[PDB]
Amino acid sequence: MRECISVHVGQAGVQIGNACWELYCLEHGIQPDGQMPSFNTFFSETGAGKHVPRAVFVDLEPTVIDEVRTGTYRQLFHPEQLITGKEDAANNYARGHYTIGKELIDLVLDRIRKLADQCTGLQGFLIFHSFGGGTGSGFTSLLMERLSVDYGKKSKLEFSIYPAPQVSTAVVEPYNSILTTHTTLEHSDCAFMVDNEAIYDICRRNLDIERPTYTNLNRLIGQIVSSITASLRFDGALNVDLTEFQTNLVPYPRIHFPLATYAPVISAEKAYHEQLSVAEITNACFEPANQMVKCDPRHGKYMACCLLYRGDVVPKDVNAAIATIKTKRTIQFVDWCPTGFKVGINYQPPTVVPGGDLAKVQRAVCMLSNTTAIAEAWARLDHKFDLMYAKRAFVHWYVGEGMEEGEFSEAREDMAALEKDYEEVGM
Amino acid sequence: MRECISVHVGQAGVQIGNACWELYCLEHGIQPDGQMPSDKTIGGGDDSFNTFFSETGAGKHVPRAVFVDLEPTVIDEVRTGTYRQLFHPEQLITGKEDAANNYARGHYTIGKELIDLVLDRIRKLADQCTGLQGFLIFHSFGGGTGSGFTSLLMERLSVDYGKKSKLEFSIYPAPQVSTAVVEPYNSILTTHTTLEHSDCAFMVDNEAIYDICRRNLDIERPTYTNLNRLIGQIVSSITASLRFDGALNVDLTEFQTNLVPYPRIHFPLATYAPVISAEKAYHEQLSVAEITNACFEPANQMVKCDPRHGKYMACCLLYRGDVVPKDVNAAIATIKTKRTIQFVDWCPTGFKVGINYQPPTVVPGGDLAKVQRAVCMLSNTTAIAEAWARLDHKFDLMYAKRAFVHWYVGEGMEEGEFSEAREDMAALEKDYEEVGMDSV
Amino acid sequence: QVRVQAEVKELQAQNQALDREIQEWESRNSAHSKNARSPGCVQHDKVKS
Amino acid sequence: PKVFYPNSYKFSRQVAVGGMFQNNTLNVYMEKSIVTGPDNYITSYDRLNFHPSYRVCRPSICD
Amino acid sequence: MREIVHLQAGQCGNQIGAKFWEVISDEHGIDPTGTYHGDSDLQLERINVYYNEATGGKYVPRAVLVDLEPGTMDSVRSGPFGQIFRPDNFVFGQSGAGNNWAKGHYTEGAELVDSVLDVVRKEAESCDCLQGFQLTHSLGGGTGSGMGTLLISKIREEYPDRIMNTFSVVPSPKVSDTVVEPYNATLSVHQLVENTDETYCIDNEALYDICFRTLKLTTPTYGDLNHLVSATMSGVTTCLRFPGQLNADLRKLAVNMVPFPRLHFFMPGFAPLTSRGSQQYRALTVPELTQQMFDAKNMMAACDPRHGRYLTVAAVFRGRMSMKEVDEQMLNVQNKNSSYFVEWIPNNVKTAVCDIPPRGLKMSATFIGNSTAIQELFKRISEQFTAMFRRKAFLHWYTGEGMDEMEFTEAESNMNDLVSEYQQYQ
Amino acid sequence: EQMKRDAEIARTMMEEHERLIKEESAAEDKRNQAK
């Protein structure tokens, strides 16, 4: 009864959730309009023979929801679940926090209530979002704060697109990223992150694919999320519950931002020639290339490492390759973590999407790292904000829509405290 | 589990491995698709392919070789040929800009962008080894990649790996008929960076194989495809003792301690005795004794060098086919007691005999015939000091008027490096003359 | 135009200074590894131990 | 007047209207690679950018 | 949802206005009768942004055509796409302003203001939730420049939340018609530095220089420049009409472009402009397309960016097209130049992409530029207001209706506030 | 499928450009008529 409720907010949220729910619907035998010609982890069941996802979709620009409401998944959802605003948040943290989201936060929380009363053994929520936009910062912050002070100590997992060093589409992206990190530093249990520039480089290099679109990224993020949550639906040698990451990965209650990757990202024309054993894939997780977030790995030391294996895997291969990784003394593990790793195994192998590009591989690993390397990304994300805020660029819209000048400053200090906290737990 | 890593380099290395790997797919039952056929895939009693071929879990065999050059037009006939899907596609390294027949262009300018890349694909291939018997370099003393980058691989393989065997196959520039003019600047400047970092290096002229083809194989006008079948037969016969069991099994690590009397005299020359056109194999008996008497000829060598003007330091005779070893030992006593075949008076033992059971095979279209038994002689005679008295004179005439030196000094090289690698062969022309002298 | 040509020549000189220093550092790191490995080998000492 | 070879100029006017091509653009060009693959993006000054192919014993960062 | 009510002003507007609805209606598959004959169902889902549905399934645009001589309405109604508007909307006077700002602001224009707001307020109440308006006009004359400054400052009086966007043809001195173009233009910015805060700058001199080099045209008629103007006012609200892989509507482009609230004068330019002789040989990829956005001759405002420094850049693309070639190409231009593009804005490019190209093209784009070189266009029109106003050459034509000599000086340094504010940020 | 779609789009645009060429030749002959 390991049910989780998934809310997708932001265009990054719903466009990831399209690939995620096509993956979950092909995971079981469910035909996509709902019927069927173990699945109670994500789907409620009605006696006509229909399956309903535990999903709430929301944006404040109607066209990105309405393409889902018209497209081929129109009969999957109860069509009141596809929440929709009227006026766009306009890339504005103040508008998605203080001004525009006050019309729709009540509706999305009441539908969250009805789904959580449909459920019976509740475990967590999956909030899909970015650090770029107004409704991807402010509305997500209000959603997380209200769900924390309403539901209790249940795992509100959040998934975050992360702002890259030299890759961005907005101009004001440090402002709303440092603001959403400040106000969502406290009430999310864990926050996984991915970098679009690093996925771009992996798509260029490992998969032999030039000029990738956004579907070719969202397929990879769907494979990541399915490898996270295969343990609740399918049983294995060593299952890992979703609560176990909270006591496992994060050591201090501001350090809940682990990185991820997934090692057999390989096209068919090369995986036909190459075998990919367990020692091969778990050694291949630790390259500076094949990670999925741009931080220099060798400048940081490792804190913890939660591996999730999927498919045919015999536990001695894992237990030998882990020590083989550990003894090298260049992969620096911190001197107050002699345990090092945490490993889980599930039997059912990774699946395949129609219209896909990842090759069907018998076994796969998704590893969740917690590095010290991301201090450079927080240094640069504080620096860009400091460059703009020396002479008050772009601030007057947000101060006309709802914060004074000092709250950006206190978010700056409440974010710099975290960069001091890494040097504290590093030395 | 024994293994070799057959690393090629140069445009005259990819054209050798094209005719070398088609032989090893025929020795075993391997299709060009890579998968074994239906008859041998149910029993699976043979594990002789593990020396050269890998084995994936889905039943495909991928060979252990990496192809290196800076000229992108001879690798691109491999990615469209018959062997398109055999080789792993990450093992065909290929540069955009050329080498263009300058040593210094292929040591300092261009080759540094590929010295790191090929040393990651090498580290894959040598990582599956329970035990590495030895590499197999195929290069050429002619131009940029085959002579310059080969020296860059030698100073980085031995620093990486160390006391591990690394055999070498190399053409040698002809006495008279060669195809370049800057060429003696290279062959004096690639011996100097190979005197230290190569455990053994065989010597072949392409001119002497042009002489055996008008004489023995009875072929007029031979192309370059018929030069890489003869060299491809020898590198089969050297490494056949790893794969197929024998009566006197002689590994690769056996050779490098058993042929060199002094540690800079590692230049043995080789030959393959029973090369007969398929018409004359119908006429001639090919016993075990008479193809031992036909290696020491003045005409079946492979370097244009007649060893009548030198004393044989040692031999290493490797036999293949159906032989019985009473009849091998009858013939080696003939060659020692014959008057002309000179042996150095600090080697009264002399020889090294190896036996294997597999007869030599036939490639379809190959001019060679199916002969029941075949040998392969390996010697480092004293007579090779004649051939350096030809090449080192050709370096001296050009360097006297300082011809052709202005491309080298401008392409990342100092002018002094011709001087120190000229004095270095002023020792090796003497180092053969001190050990050919009779005992005092 | 003339002051911009002065800065072009300045940055060319700075570029060649960093290029020289790249050459010296590459030679130093390769020679350091070459001299560092020379007694003994890697990981076979561990297996033998 | 059996044969006639007159100097036509319609293409010359058609291309020479408005002045010849002079490039007025912000500086855009990619420094390309040396190894020819769709992967394996190696420039002289940004080497070590290739796909580190899979190794059984040790990972790539500890060579 | 996110509707916009269109407005015109003067002769220079209606030639751009009637060319606009020859372009928007042809993008939606609409006949001049107004009834739909399209091909895709996607062409009608967000038709409610600009249009409105009458009985019988006929669509009427939300536009009001405003002028001050009734020969201009007969010009547009008789046109091909001109009978589409509701005929209760052609609001005009009868006694012409006649290139007099003081007529079109104080005496002649203000007689007609109480009428024109009724047709404005009835097409905006029919909307459910406004996003803004549109004014297409010029800044040379007095019928459209001076009514245009009237018609904005009395429309900020009513709907000051909803974001308004005008499109102005700024008059160059190199190709000029009337003598007193300083006397109308350098002071009409007094209510366009304040009241619209979204205003574009199009020069007729640069619109010719596109037509001699890139297009390489022989005879450029005034029906082909408004072709070039109305195909880039369309491009900035295609995300607002059509679905996007990464979209940004009208309000999102405001909050990311303008660094400080009085610098909102823009530099538009269409990307894949090509001649009919060199059309076939030309490649259509994305790195070829950024070759043509950042030119100094494919810019519709007659001021050169290399004599200044860029503040911010947007580039709304179109078509079925990849996303690394958007992002990595425009990082490349930002990295390799780094001198025009300022410090203390660590990323100087915004971007967006739709899914549906303009009719008949594989791919296009629309470049929006915000440059600090626009202060030479304000310098070169206020120096021509120093010369005529020292010896008081023409002030009697406009001061028979009442403006003292310092209301020109009051709006001189109010315009010359704007020259120095580009200077202090450079 | 993508290759077939791109070839079809290229043929459509070249047909439209031939239509433009014929229209402009007609207009130039109309100007010669006006002479």
Ligand SMILES: Nc1nc2c(ncn2[C@@H]2O[C@H](COP(=O)(O)OP(=O)(O)OP(=O)(O)O)[C@@H](O)[C@H]2O)c(=O)[nH]1
């Ligand atoms: N993985 C993925 N990322 C996307 C996709 N679309 C946009 N992004 C990322 O999202 C970031 C911007 O998202 P936002 O700024 O929040 O835009 P939004 O989600 O529409 O939020 P609002 O504009 O406020 O409605 C960009 O930096 C993109 O890299 C997508 O389809 N897939």
Ligand SMILES: Nc1nc2c(ncn2[C@@H]2O[C@H](COP(=O)(O)OP(=O)(O)OP(=O)(O)O)[C@@H](O)[C@H]2O)c(=O)[nH]1
């Ligand atoms: N025996 C033999 N010799 C060859 C073959 N192909 C080429 N050669 C010889 O090898 C030399 C060819 O030049 P190489 O140096 O090998 O070409 P490379 O190694 O790519 O060097 P560059 O051409 O400068 O890049 C010439 O002397 C040829 O006579 C071959 O297939 N067999």
Ligand SMILES: Nc1nc2c(ncn2[C@@H]2O[C@H](COP(=O)(O)OP(=O)(O)O)[C@@H](O)[C@H]2O)c(=O)[nH]1
């Ligand atoms: N785009 C366009 N501009 C025009 C046209 N006719 C005149 N103009 C411009 O209008 C400016 C003069 O302003 P004017 O049109 O008289 O303003 P009006 O009083 O509203 O008509 C000149 O600088 C011209 O560049 C036209 O047909 N199309």
Ligand SMILES: [Mg+2]
């Ligand atoms: Mg949005």
Ligand SMILES: [Mg+2]
């Ligand atoms: Mg070559």
